[PDB]
Enzyme design. Structure first.
Site, PDB file in Angstrom:
ATOM      1  N   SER B 197       0.660  -0.901   0.034  1.00 52.78           N
ATOM      2  CA  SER B 197      -0.072  -0.182   0.032  1.00 52.78           C
ATOM      3  C   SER B 197       1.044   1.176   0.229  1.00 52.78           C
ATOM      4  O   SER B 197       1.281   1.783  -1.211  1.00 52.78           O
ATOM      5  CB  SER B 197      -0.873  -0.051   1.302  1.00 52.78           C
ATOM      6  OG  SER B 197      -1.682   1.315   1.298  1.00 52.78           O
ATOM      7  N   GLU B 324      -8.666  -4.432  -4.895  1.00 56.86           N
ATOM      8  CA  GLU B 324      -8.121  -3.840  -4.736  1.00 56.86           C
ATOM      9  C   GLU B 324      -9.165  -2.191  -3.861  1.00 56.86           C
ATOM     10  O   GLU B 324      -8.955  -1.446  -2.935  1.00 56.86           O
ATOM     11  CB  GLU B 324      -6.778  -2.829  -4.969  1.00 56.86           C
ATOM     12  CG  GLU B 324      -5.495  -3.542  -6.004  1.00 56.86           C
ATOM     13  CD  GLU B 324      -4.822  -3.945  -4.507  1.00 56.86           C
ATOM     14  OE1 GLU B 324      -4.978  -3.767  -3.230  1.00 56.86           O
ATOM     15  OE2 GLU B 324      -3.638  -5.001  -4.848  1.00 56.86           O
ATOM     16  N   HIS B 437      -7.189  -5.782  -0.396  1.00 53.82           N
ATOM     17  CA  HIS B 437      -6.274  -4.568  -0.469  1.00 53.82           C
ATOM     18  C   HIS B 437      -5.907  -4.866   1.273  1.00 53.82           C
ATOM     19  O   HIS B 437      -5.788  -4.752   2.078  1.00 53.82           O
ATOM     20  CB  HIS B 437      -7.082  -3.528  -0.488  1.00 53.82           C
ATOM     21  CG  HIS B 437      -5.828  -2.555  -0.045  1.00 53.82           C
ATOM     22  ND1 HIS B 437      -4.568  -2.506  -0.971  1.00 53.82           N
ATOM     23  CD2 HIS B 437      -5.499  -1.121   0.447  1.00 53.82           C
ATOM     24  CE1 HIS B 437      -3.606  -1.066  -0.953  1.00 53.82           C
ATOM     25  NE2 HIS B 437      -4.696  -1.147   0.641  1.00 53.82           N
TER      26      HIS B 437
END
Ligand SMILES: *[C@@H]1O[C@H](CO)[C@@H](O[C@@H]2O[C@H](CO)[C@@H](O[C@@H]3O[C@H](CO)[C@@H](O)[C@H](O[C@H]4O[C@H](CO)[C@@H](O)[C@H](O)[C@@H]4O[C@H]4O[C@H](CO)[C@@H](O)[C@H](O)[C@@H]4O)[C@@H]3O)[C@H](O)[C@H]2NC(C)=O)[C@H](O)[C@H]1NC(C)=O
Ligand SMILES: *[C@@H]1O[C@H](CO)[C@@H](O[C@@H]2O[C@H](CO)[C@@H](O[C@@H]3O[C@H](CO)[C@@H](O)[C@H](O[C@H]4O[C@H](CO)[C@@H](O)[C@H](O)[C@@H]4O[C@H]4O[C@H](CO)[C@@H](O)[C@H](O)[C@@H]4O)[C@@H]3O)[C@H](O)[C@H]2NC(C)=O)[C@H](O)[C@H]1NC(C)=O
Ligand code: DME
Ligand code: DME
Ligand code: NAG
Ligand code: NAG
Ligand code: NAG
Ligand code: NAG
Lengths: 532, 532
Positions: B197, B324, B437
């Site tokens: 991330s 995501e 995610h």
């Protein structure tokens, strides 16, 4: 006598013609207007002065002056569309095929030929109405109209070249049918106009045009619609092209009087020679002299007439072919040829979309490209070929017609929509061109019924189904028989948007014909090009 | 002693920790910087003053001050990401897991946590390095860095709040590893940074930033890249947000000195309370205080550095998860909720794309909509849900990373690209959110090896493959074993663009990850928004 018919214009003598080992009557080359010659070139049509004595209607009339395709000399695929008669400005005639014995009042179908408003003839082999008249027991009419500069030169403000006179030619044929078809056993209360390509666009223009609406009951549109981007231009664009034509013939341009006078002194072929010099862009599927949005023939813009419901509310039946684009790529786009697979390089692809969307800025071209490129492959010559083919068909034919369908259907009294996707087993054009623009016509006219023309049996059956849909629709406003064990061709509704495939397989019913792409061409791209 | 290590900062005492019925050493909460407190809030990190005596490194340090998710109290899915220690501005510590016996010089992997630059901790259960250190015989480091306003408030022109200090925190940890990891048996010549991330974006920023390049050999980026639209802002945008934050705390705005002084007088939680008030748009997947393109840390714009090859040329391994977007829709987009299928109406779809593309004019929104709508269905709530999910993932994660991959690969010395698409059988979030995610992380850290945590056996096997790819890559710049009967994970090349699916099924090799959409997000849409 049965070949002798007395009309409001005078007496007419026809011929007996053989059809599938039977006979019917044919009245070929009946005049519906005065010859538009000399002083009358570019003017409105005048009604035909009544004649005494008998008009010999035993042979086809002349064809209108026009461009002749000579890309493929002797090739029947191309030459089937050229004039098969002597060309003449003296060309405003219609032909009528009548069953034997003569009926009292049957359904009438009036055929309006295509050819991009630059070409076309009522007299082509594929347009012989005798098979249809005989098989479906209808009176078949085919009209003619001036094409090219002769029918569509538009110097708005003048009466010597008002524009749209080719469309008025059509209306005068329709007026004549309205007035005289009763004497041939036709029902003037049940006349269906039908056409293909520009003829389909013309049919839709008669639907829109208040002066044409009262002259027919119903309409069929094949691969053509009035709002197609090639089908019309503004009055200023028509004026530019008129002037530019005169510039090409070294005419005097001080005034409309002096320009038109000069264009009248020219021999017809001199105008035809320079017709394509006046297009303002490098394009395909665009034609020099087409209808103008003038204010007379169309009270306002086509789009606001469709939005406000300013049109004849009736039943329509219409559709498109799988591969409308392929003809125009063959003739006008680099990479394509008659005798190869025509695998298209990346450069010929980019060249091709430019040609296909001539007003598009670079962002517009990127948008089309993004929409029609498979990015997994990207360099595949077949996919480029097929993508490009779809661009030309979708932009010029399928998506305009779908816009028309969706807008007509809100106010109309019945829509039936078809997608014709049968590749004829005896087709002369290469496989890559697919189901070609104009090749449903042979099924609509019943050529698959004649043994000598080498169609399959299941093709005979397809043509019989199609002639029956068309004629029944002309007759009642529904292509289906009341009883009939065969599956129903359903109405196209706003909600469900159903249409049918028209092919040799048992009828499948689909929904929302090419919506993804038509949202792109009808909503997104215009908005994009307007915002830039 | 084996838990006693002598460093350039002073002596350190670790703990023996159990791992899968064996032991390793752990040095938790070692300081690499001075505490950024009082006068030092918002300033560059200072190196840690050497200490005499032994630093007790037997327990985790505090976490940095940060936003705490309280949407789902007690729900492990959300709370697994919150601070599990006391929060403090005194938070610049790193943790080191070392095999037993101590090696002489093995591969080093330095973990940089994510959390959108507003949150994150080195101390989370999922980030426990002991499983990986033990299984793959590597020295695992996890660093920390200031997040939120504390790490990224940016009043460019000042030294009191220069911007990017959270990234400098990271670099100082890396400097410390470079200088001291040898004493733990780590090889300073073979250190691999990896993150997810914002940590993945941070890794790519260290690749780009000339001042960070010399401090590691190789990099792994998971679901994050430096050029992501949420990962950075311009100096003027940072300045606006700094001022706007001060406006929310009733601070004096006459000057930078008086603003920063005032923001320093505030208790930490007062800043965190108003952090989200400073975003200039109604958006999702956008965070208030992120890296600035300042001219110091990055010599020029990210894009020109990628184009010109101004970056560390080495091997990279990177990838993305199937879904995501789903987290950010759950938290910030109408229609989505944790405990329903979250079928999305047409209105919540349109609302959702606005939120997802906040700088987009109406034409930009129409373009996204056209791209992600199935026009055959159109009103299907599942397709709207999934379309929207794909928009958020593609725009914010997948397509930026693909741009980075394609540009890094022209100048780099080896790229390996993965697409992780296994939905964990024990996942607590609803099925609609898909492969979420952050949920490849648990496989990278080997949690599927612990019996008590309820993973499947084939999930244990997937995690072992992944830990082995990661560690081997750290070790050699290739995730594959020289011999090995298992199928090769091929290089990503400009020409072939190969990547692999990372799941429980036998390895399939694919090409051109999401190109259709990434041409839209990386080429077409920017061009569209710039031209308007
Ligand atoms: C239904 O199906 C059948 C079977 O598929 C089709 O029948 C075929 O039709 C073609 C012609 O249409 C025919 O080919 C001709 O055969 C002749 C005898 O072998 C040839 O003499 C003739 O060649 C001339 O024309 C060619 C142009 O197409 C030239 O390439 C060639 O040089 C010849 O040109 C000559 O022309 C001038 C003027 O006549 C002359 O002075 C010179 O000598 C000059 O050389 C064709 O090749 C096939 O043989 C037919 N096959 C069969 C089995 O009958 C039929 O066409 C289909 N029907 C429909 C309506 O589609
Ligand atoms: C591996 O798999 C197993 C099997 O799937 C998982 O084991 C299950 O774990 C849950 C809890 O995580 C457990 O549920 C509890 O059962 C207890 C006994 O029946 C209940 O007392 C308890 O209820 C309390 O907590 C709930 C919140 O989740 C509340 O809804 C409920 O009102 C109760 O709340 C009480 O809390 C306070 C403080 O304790 C107390 O004062 C009050 O009384 C208040 O009411 C849970 O329902 C399952 O029974 C377990 N099942 C089995 C077969 O063991 C395990 O979680 C998995 N492991 C991992 C790591 O994922
Ligand atoms: C079904 N018809 C009869 C209607 C249309 C197809 C007839 C062949 C001509 C198509 C190629 C376009 C040529 C373009 N012009 C000559 C301008 C180059
Ligand atoms: C894998 N991690 C740890 C990196 C990121 C996922 C952790 C859950 C938070 C995602 C939802 C965004 C919340 C938006 N904010 C709070 C601004 C509303
Ligand atoms: C009509 O014209 C044809 C051919 O031109 C001719 O053979 C025929 O005799 C004519 N008909 C009459 C009634 O004169
Ligand atoms: C068309 O018109 C008739 C008669 O006015 C009406 O009853 C019928 O429902 C209409 N059909 C359609 C399809 O609109
Ligand atoms: C380090 O701290 C732990 C827990 O805070 C404590 O139990 C232990 O005694 C300490 N170690 C030393 C060497 O003092
Ligand atoms: C990387 O660098 C080495 C040594 O300089 C070179 O020989 C090798 O081919 C390179 N590999 C790639 C994938 O670029």
């Amino acid at each position: 006598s049965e070949l002798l018919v007395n009309t409001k214009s005078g007496k007419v003598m026809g011929t007996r013609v053989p059809v599938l080992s039977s006979h019917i009557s044919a009245f070929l080359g009946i005049p519906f207007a005065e010859p538009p010659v000399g002083n009358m070139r570019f003017r409105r049509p005048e009604p035909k002065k009544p004649w005494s004595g008998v008009w010999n209607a035993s042979t086809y009339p002349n064809n209108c002056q026009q461009y002749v395709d000579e890309q493929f000399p002797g090739f029947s695929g191309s030459e089937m569309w050229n004039p098969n008669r002597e060309m003449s400005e003296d060309c405003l005639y219609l032909n009528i095929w009548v069953p034997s014995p003569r009926p009292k009042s049957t359904t009438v179908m009036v055929w309006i030929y295509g050819g991009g408003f630059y070409s076309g003839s009522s007299t082509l082999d594929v347009y012989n109405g005798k098979y249809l008249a005989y098989t479906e027991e209808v009176v078949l009419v085919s009209l003619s109209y001036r094409v090219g500069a002769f029918g569509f030169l538009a110097l708005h403000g003048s009466q010597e070249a008002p524009g749209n006179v080719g469309l008025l030619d059509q209306r005068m044929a329709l007026q004549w049918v309205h007035d005289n078809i009763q004497f041939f056993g036709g029902d003037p209360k049940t006349v269906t106009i039908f056409g293909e390509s520009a003829g389909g666009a013309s049919v839709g223009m008669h639907i829109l045009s208040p002066g044409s609406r009262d002259l027919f009951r119903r309409a069929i549109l094949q691969s053509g619609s009035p709002n197609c981007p090639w089908a019309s231009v503004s009055v200023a664009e028509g004026r530019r092209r008129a002037v530019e034509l005169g510039r090409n013939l070294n005419c005097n341009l001080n005034s409309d009087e002096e320009l038109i006078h000069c264009l009248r002194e020219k021999k017809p072929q001199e105008l035809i020679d320079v017709e394509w010099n006046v297009l303002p862009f490098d394009s395909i599927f665009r034609f020099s002299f087409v209808p103008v949005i003038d204010g007379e023939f169309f009270p306002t813009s086509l789009e606001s007439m469709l939005n406000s419901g300013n049109f004849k509310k009736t039943q329509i039946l219409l559709g498109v072919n799988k591969d409308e684009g392929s003809f125009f790529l063959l003739y006008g786009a680099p990479g394509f040829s008659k005798d190869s697979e025509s695998k298209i390089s990346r450069e010929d692809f980019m060249s091709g979309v430019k040609l296909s969307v001539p007003h598009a800025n670079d962002l517009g071209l990127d948008a089309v490209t993004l929409q029609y490129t498979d990015w997994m492959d990207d360099n595949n010559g077949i996919k480029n070929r097929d993508g490009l083919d779809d661009i030309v068909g979708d932009h010029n034919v399928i998506c305009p017609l779908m816009h028309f369908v969706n807008k007509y259907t809100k106010f109309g009294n019945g829509t039936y929509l078809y997608f014709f996707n049968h590749r004829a087993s005896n087709l002369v054009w290469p496989e890559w061109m697919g189901v070609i623009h104009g090749y449903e016509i042979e099924f609509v006219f019943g050529l698959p019924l004649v043994k000598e023309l080498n169609y399959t049996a299941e093709e005979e059956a397809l043509s019989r189904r199609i002639m029956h849909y068309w004629a029944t629709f002309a007759k009642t406003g529904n292509p289906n028989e009341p009883h009939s064990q065969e599956s129903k061709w359903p109405l196209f509704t706003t909600k469900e948007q159903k249409f049918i495939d028209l092919n040799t397989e048992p009828m499948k019913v689909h929904q929302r014909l090419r919506v993804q792409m038509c949202v792109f061409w009808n909503q997104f791209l215009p908005k994009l090009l307007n915002a830039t």
